[PDB]
Each structure stands twice: as C-alpha cells, then as structure tokens.
Design a protein around this ligand. Structure first.
Ligand SMILES: CS(=O)(=O)Nc1ccc(CN)cc1
Ligand SMILES: CS(=O)(=O)Nc1ccc(CN)cc1
Ligand SMILES: [Zn+2]
Length: 140
C-alpha cells in the first residue's frame, strides 16, 4: 500500500484505489496502473522533474529502503500477478530488487523528489509506475 500526496492530489495504484478515490476522481489510466483523486489537505511530496535512473525505493515486505538503478519508463510485458493478468504496462521502470503485491505504493525517490510508486514485482525485479511526466500534478 501507499500513495503520493502532492498538492491537493492523491496518487495511488489504480488497482488499490478505493470507492472514495473513484468518487473524487481526477485522472486514471489502467495501462499505467495509476489513479489520481482529489484531497482536502495539502500533501508533503514533491514530484521529481528529471530523467534520473538512480534512486531509493521503499519495500514494505522487508521494512527497508533500497538504493536501485532503474530503466527509463517503457512499455513492458508484465507476467500475471495476484492483482492483474499478464499484460503490457506503459510508463513502467524496472530495477533489480524485491517486490511482492503488498509492496505496491512504496515510493521511489531521487535527488529531485518522488519518481514513482511500486507497481510490479516477481522474478527478482521491482517495477515502478513513473509519475514524472504528469506535470499537472504540480499545479491547480
Ligand atoms: C513507451 S511508454 O511505455 O509509453 N513510456 C513513455 C511514453 C511517452 C513518453 C513521453 N515522452 C515517454 C515514455
Ligand atoms: C488469474 S491471475 O493470474 O491470478 N491474475 C489476476 C489477478 C487478479 C485479477 C482481478 N480479480 C485478475 C487476474
Ligand atoms: Zn531525479
């Protein structure tokens, strides 16, 4: 579990969005596994605006943050998980590291701020849904 709180937006994995998220929907994209809903309180996170490929992510299933190198966001085939069938996911970054289903929502961060959230796992990789292209998260 986990979210990004930027401005008056809450960014969550689409597959973990709640009814309240859907009832306050801003934007969602199944191919990216992302959903954004509106919030009443302003959030503490800053979105990275960069093309870093190194950062640190939180792994709930280890209670640890790990430094990783990761691929640039791409269209990637993802094997079946507990929450999606096998399918292509867009805007996905991969690193070598541990990720189970409940790790989804952990933040990946670089020197510029939040890069994305855990979205995929298995076979010794962790996949992160990028948010750095969503420039509108920083205004309105
Ligand atoms: C190929 S992909 O998975 O859609 N990722 C992607 C898409 C668009 C841009 C925007 N410059 C960058 C990366
Ligand atoms: C059958 S599967 O490989 O476990 N993948 C899967 C997981 C969850 C849903 C949603 N109920 C759909 C497909
Ligand atoms: Zn960066």
């Amino acid at each position: 579990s986990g979210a990004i709180y930027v401005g008056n937006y809450r960014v969550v994995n689409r597959h973990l969005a709640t009814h309240n998220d859907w009832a306050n929907l801003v934007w969602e994209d199944s191919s990216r596994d992302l959903l954004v809903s509106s919030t009443t309180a302003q959030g503490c996170d800053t979105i990275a605006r960069c093309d870093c490929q190194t950062g640190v992510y939180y792994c709930s299933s280890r209670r640890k943050h790990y430094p990783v190198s990761f691929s640039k966001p791409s269209l990637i085939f993802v094997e079946a998980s507990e929450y999606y069938p096998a399918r292509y996911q867009s805007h996905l970054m991969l690193a070598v590291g541990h990720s189970e289903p409940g790790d989804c929502g952990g933040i990946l961060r670089c020197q510029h701020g939040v890069v994305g959230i855990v979205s995929t796992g298995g076979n010794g990789l962790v996949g992160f849904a990028d948010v750095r292209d969503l420039l509108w998260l920083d205004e309105e």
